[PDB]
Amino acid sequence: RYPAAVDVAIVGSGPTASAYARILSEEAPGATIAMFEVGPTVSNPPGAHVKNIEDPDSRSLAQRASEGPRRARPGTYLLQDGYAFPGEDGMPVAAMSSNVGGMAAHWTAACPRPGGKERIPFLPDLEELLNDADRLLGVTTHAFDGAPFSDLVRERLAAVVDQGRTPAFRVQPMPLAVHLVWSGSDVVMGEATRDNPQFELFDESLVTRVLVEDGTAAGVEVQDRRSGDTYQVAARYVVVGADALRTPQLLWASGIRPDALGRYLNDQAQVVFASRLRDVQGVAWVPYTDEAPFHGQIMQLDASPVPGSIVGLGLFCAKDLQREDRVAFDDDTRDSYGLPAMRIHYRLTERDHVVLDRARQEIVRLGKAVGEPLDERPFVLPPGASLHYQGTTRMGETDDGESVCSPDSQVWQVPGLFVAGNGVIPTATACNPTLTSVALAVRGARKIAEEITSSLL
Ligand SMILES: Cc1cc2nc3c(=O)[nH]c(=O)nc-3n(C[C@H](O)[C@H](O)[C@H](O)COP(=O)(O)OP(=O)(O)OC[C@H]3O[C@@H](n4cnc5c(N)ncnc54)[C@H](O)[C@@H]3O)c2cc1C
Ligand SMILES: O=c1c2cc(O)c(O)cc2oc2cc(O)c([C@@H]3O[C@H](CO)[C@@H](O)[C@H](O)[C@H]3O)c(O)c12
C-alpha cells in the first residue's frame, strides 16, 4: 500500500503537519512526500472543516468518525485512564482527534498573534512566519464587517480595555481562518499540495515507530489499519505532527527519549462567562499582556446558555511552566492503538490559581462592559478543555535538557527528525496556539526544503 521509500515522511494530517507538506510542495517540488494519518478521511477535500458538510446527519457522521476507535465535544475523544493522579490536577478532559485534518476539521479558526512574553524571543523572523501562517490558514480580520453587533460589542469592550494600551493590545476583531466556511487542513495543504504529483496522503495509516539509522532519521513504521499489516517506509526526513500528546508518545515508542520529552506541559486555563446586549430589534479579541496574562475572545451565541444579542466570553490564562508537568508513558500498558499508555502529570501551582482568580474577575469586568451579565458567576473549565497543550516537544536554543527540538523544530538527538504542533511552543502562552504552531512549522519545513534543494544526494 505504501511506497518503499520517500524523501519526507509526515506523521499526522493536522494544520502543522500540513504546513510541512505545504511549504515542501511549494519550495521543494521534487521531494517525494508521504503523509500518514491514523484517522479516516471525513471531509472533501481531505482535511476540510466538518461545517462544510451542510447535512447535519452527514456532519455528525464525520464528527463521530473522528472520535477515535466527563464527555468530549463532537469530533474529539478523551483518554480513558492516566489523566489524573492523587496530589495533582491532571487533565480530565484532555481530548484528541483522529481524522484527516486533525482538530482543524473541528476547530473555530481563531488565529490571534502572540505578544509580550508569549512571543518566542530567539526567533528573529517570528512576525515573518506569523504572516506566512496567515497565508496558509487563510486568516482574515474582516470576516464580519457586515455584522450588526460585532462593532457594538467591540467598542463597548474597548471602553474598558484600551485604556493605556498600545494599538496591538487593544480590543480588535479576532483574526479568523475563514475560507462562512471555517478553514481546515484542506486550506493549509491547498492546491499546491493536492496538485503535487510527489505528495500522497494515506489515511487510516497508524505510524507506530520512527526509524533511525546511524543517528539520523531513517523512516517510519506504518501499520495499514485497513488490513493490519505493518509496513516500513524509508525517509531522509521524518516530520511528526500528530498532536501535543501522541507526538511525544511516538518518539517515546521509537526509543527517542530525551529528558525534556513531554515535560513542561502546559494547558491554557479557560474561564467562560456570558452577557446580554442593550439594543432592541463576529469574534472580538481582548489581547494578552504581561501584566494581565489572559487571552479573551468574545463571540455571539445562537441562544442563551442559561434559561445574536447574547455574547459568550472566554478568557485563557498563561501557565506557570513547571518541569514536573511531565507527560509520562508506560511501555507495559498500551492504549487503544497499541502505543504506550499516557500518564498526565498536571498540577496548578499557587501562581496558577492567582492568575486564574484574576481571570474570573477580569471576565466579569469584561461582561459588565458588554451589558447585563447573563450568568452570575464565571465558570472555570476542567484542565484540558482549551485543547491548547504546549511544551511537550518544545523548542530551545540549546540542548540543555529543557527543550526537545531546535529553533528549526529539529529534534536534537535525532537529525532529520522534526516535530510539529502546539507542543513545540516553549513559552508561557495564553492565545490560541495553532497560528503560532503553523508559523513554527513553516520555519521547520523551510529548514528541510533548503536542505533538500541544496543537497547533492
Ligand atoms: C472544538 C475545537 C475548537 C478549537 N478552536 C480553536 C481556536 O479557535 N483556535 C486555535 O488556535 N485552536 C483551536 N482548536 C485547536 C486546534 O484545532 C489544534 O490546536 C490544531 O489542530 C493543532 O494542530 P496539529 O496539527 O498540531 O494537531 P492535530 O490537528 O491534532 O494533528 C494531529 C494529527 O495526527 C494524527 N495522528 C496522531 N497520532 C498518529 C500516529 N501515530 N500516526 C499517524 N497519525 C497520527 C491525528 O489523528 C491527527 O489527525 C480547537 C479545537 C477544537 C476541538
Ligand atoms: O465547538 C464550537 C462550535 C460549534 C458550533 O456548532 C457552532 O455553530 C459554533 C461553535 O463555536 C465554538 C467556539 C469556541 O470558541 C469554542 C472553543 O472552546 C474551546 C475549549 O472548550 C477552545 O479550544 C477554543 O479555543 C474555543 O474557541 C468551541 O469549542 C466552539
Q: Is 110 in the pocket of ligand 1 (CB under 6 A)?
A: yes
**Domain for residue 376, yes or no?**
no
* Residues with a known catalytic role: 388
**Domain for residue 319, yes or no?**
no
Q: How far apart are CA 18 and CA 10, in angstroms?
A: 8
Query: Helix, strand, or coil here: 90?
Result: coil
Residue 45: is the preceding peptide bond cis (ω within 30°)? yes
Give one DSSP letter per residue of 220-274, joined into a string: EEEEETTT-PEEEEEEEEEEE-S-TTHHHHHHHHTT---TTSS-S-EE--EEEEE
Q: Please choose, from the candidates 94, 44, 49, the residue with its C-alpha nearest in 3D space to the C-alpha of residue 73.
A: 94
Q: How far apart are CA 89 and CA 253, in angstroms?
A: 26
Q: How far apart are CA 369 and CA 361, in angstroms?
A: 13
Cell numbers at residue 426, please?
516553549
> Is 178 in contact with 112 (CB distance < 8 Å)?
no
Q: Please choose, from the candidates 361, 440, 448, 355, the residue with its C-alpha nearest in 3D space to the C-alpha of residue 394.
A: 440
CATH of the domain at 62: 3.50.50.60
Element (H, E) at 176: strand 176-177
**Domain for residue 45, yes or no?**
yes
Q: From the alpha carbon of 316, which atom of ligand 2 is closest?
A: 25
Amino acid identity at 393? T
Cell numbers at residue 204, please?
487510516
Q: Which residues pair with 298 in a beta bridge?
A: 284, 313
Cell numbers at residue 250, please?
511516538
Q: Identify the residue whose C-alpha is closest to ligand 1 atom 32.
A: 242
Give one DSSP letter per residue of 59-87, joined into a string: HHHHHHTTS----PPTT-EE-SSSS--TT
Q: Is 97 in the pocket of ligand 2 (CB under 6 A)?
A: no
Q: For residue 165, what are the contacts with CB-CB under 8 A and spacing of at least 6?
A: 289
Q: Identify the residue whose C-alpha is closest to ligand 2 atom 24.
A: 386
Please state the domain count of the chain: 1
Cell numbers at residue 200, please?
500522497
What is the sign of the dihedral through the CA atoms of 333, 336, 337 and 338? positive
DSSP 190: H
* The 3-state secondary structure of 394-429, one letter per residue: CECCCCCCCCCECCCCEECCCCCEEECCHHHCCCCC
**Domain for residue 60, yes or no?**
yes
Task: List the domain range (segments joined by +) for residue 63.
Answer: 5-84+94-138+183-266+388-454
Q: Is 431 in the pocket of ligand 1 (CB under 6 A)?
A: no
What is the sign of the dihedral through the CA atoms of 113, 320, 248 and 74? negative
Q: For residue 273, what are the contacts with CB-CB under 8 A and spacing of at least 6?
A: 312, 313, 314, 315, 363, 364, 366, 367, 373, 375, 378, 379
Cell numbers at residue 144, please?
464580519
Which experimental technique did the depositors report for determining this structure?
X-ray
Query: E-strand spans in 92-137?
Result: 95-96
Radius of gyration of the chain (CA): 21
424 annotated to bind ligand: no
Q: Which residues pair with 300 in a beta bridge?
A: 311
Cell 502546539 appears where?
Answer: 422
> Is 449 in contact with 28 (CB distance < 8 Å)?
yes
Ligand nearest to the CA of 104: 1
DSSP 163: T
Q: How far apart are CA 434 and CA 366, in angstroms?
A: 25
Ligand 2 pocket mutation pick from 51, 103, 108 by most atoms within 8 angstroms of CB: 108
Angle between helix 126-137 and helix 15-27 axes, rounded to 10 deg: 100
**Domain for residue 352, yes or no?**
no
CA distances from 72 to 77, 94, 95, 107, 386 (A): 5, 9, 7, 13, 12
Cell numbers at residue 138, please?
487563510
**Domain for residue 415, yes or no?**
yes
Q: Please choose, from the candidates 342, 404, 408, 432, the residue with its C-alpha nearest in 3D space to the C-alpha of residue 139.
A: 432
Chain breaks in the chain (C to N over 2.5 A) after: 69, 179, 281, 307
Q: How far apart are CA 106 and CA 432, in angstroms?
A: 14
Q: Is 247 in the pocket of ligand 1 (CB under 6 A)?
A: no
**How many angstroms separate the alpha carbon of residue 219 from the centre of ligand 2?**
36
CA distances from 207 to 102, 222, 223, 329 (A): 15, 4, 6, 17
Q: How far apart are CA 351 and CA 357, in angstroms?
A: 10
Cell numbers at residue 425, please?
511552543
Q: Which residues pair with 221 in a beta bridge?
A: 209, 232
> Is 366 in contact with 294 (CB distance < 8 Å)?
no
CA distances from 383 to 13, 74, 94, 327 (A): 25, 18, 7, 14
**How many angstroms separate the alpha carbon of residue 110 from the centre of ligand 2?**
10
Q: How far apart are CA 213 and CA 234, in angstroms?
A: 10
3-state helix, strand, coil in the chain (%, to 5): 25, 25, 50
Q: For residue 120, what are the contacts with CB-CB under 8 A and spacing of at least 6?
A: 114, 126, 395, 407, 425, 426, 427, 436, 440
Q: Strands 270-276, 379-380: parallel, antiparallel or unpaired by DSSP? A: antiparallel
**Domain for residue 359, yes or no?**
no
44 annotated to bind ligand: no
**Domain for residue 305, yes or no?**
no
Q: Please choose, from the candidates 208, 197, 153, the residue with its C-alpha nearest in 3D space to the C-alpha of residue 368.
A: 153
Q: Is 94 in the pocket of ligand 2 (CB under 6 A)?
A: no
**The Cα angle at residue 179 between residues 96 and 94, in degrees rounded to 5:** 10
